[PDB]
Amino acid sequence: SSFSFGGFTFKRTSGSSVKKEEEVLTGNLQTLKIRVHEGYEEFTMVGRRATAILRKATRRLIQLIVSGRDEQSIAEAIIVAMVYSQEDCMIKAVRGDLNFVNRANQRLNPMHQLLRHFQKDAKVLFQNWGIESIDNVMGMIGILPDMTPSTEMSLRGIRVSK
Ligand SMILES: O=C(O)[C@H]1[C@H]2CC[C@H](CC2)[C@@H]1Nc1nc(-c2c[nH]c3ncc(F)cc23)ncc1F
Ligand SMILES: [Cl-]
Numbered sequence: 001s002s003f004s005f006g007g008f009t010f011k012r013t014s015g016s017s018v019k020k021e022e023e024v025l026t027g028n029l030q031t032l033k034i035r036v037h038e039g040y041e042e043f044t045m046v047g048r049r050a051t052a053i054l055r056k057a058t059r060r061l062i063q064l065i066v067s068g069r070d071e072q073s074i075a076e077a078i079i080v081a082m083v084y085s086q087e088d089c090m091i092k093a094v095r096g097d098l099n100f101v102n103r104a105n106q107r108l109n110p111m112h113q114l115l116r117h118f119q120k121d122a123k124v125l126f127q128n129w130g131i132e133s134i135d136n137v138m139g140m141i142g143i144l145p146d147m148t149p150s151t152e153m154s155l156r157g158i159r160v161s162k
Pocket of ligand 1 (some may be wrong): 003005035037084085
């Protein structure tokens with residue numbers, strides 16, 4: 001069965017995961033209690049303006065292949081995938097006001113809290129994610145933290161289908 005996150009419809013296409021609650025420490029030193037998915041899984045992500053295929057494991061993005069209508073729509077998909085990955089570099093990229101601990105009995109979803117944080121401005125997320133050298137795969141291109149294309153380098157695990 002499918003579920004929506006960040007305006008993408010997710011469908012699990014392979015694998016499985018078990019759940020473990022973990023109290024992580026954000027970059028601005030707040031505690032979030034997140035349900036960590038442990039396992040090796042593949043998802044499709046279908047949005048109104050971008051599509052992606054995500055392979056991930058426990059708190060790790062392994063591969064994301066993305067297509068979309070413009071740079072902004074591609075970036076939107078990437079930010080959703082980087083939060084959904086639950087990666088420590090994404091948790092440590094949170095900056096600014098302590099606006100996760102301030103909601104009283106609202107009990108907001110920590111994954112949605114993170115997403116709304118990074119949708120505001122993903123520059124620190126992209127700068128801390130990491131880049132790698134890429135193989136030359138015809139029809140695929142790298143995307144750098146400034147969302148410009150590269151034939152040589154890319155955000156770690158991420159490729160754009162031109
Ligand atoms: O935990 C949640 O409240 C929700 C919100 C935050 C992410 C998902 C979509 C919205 C999550 N829902 C679901 N996640 C997942 C799920 C599998 N592997 C994952 N890895 C990381 C992750 F993060 C969520 C998942 N499966 C079924 C779901 F139905
Ligand atoms: Cl929420």
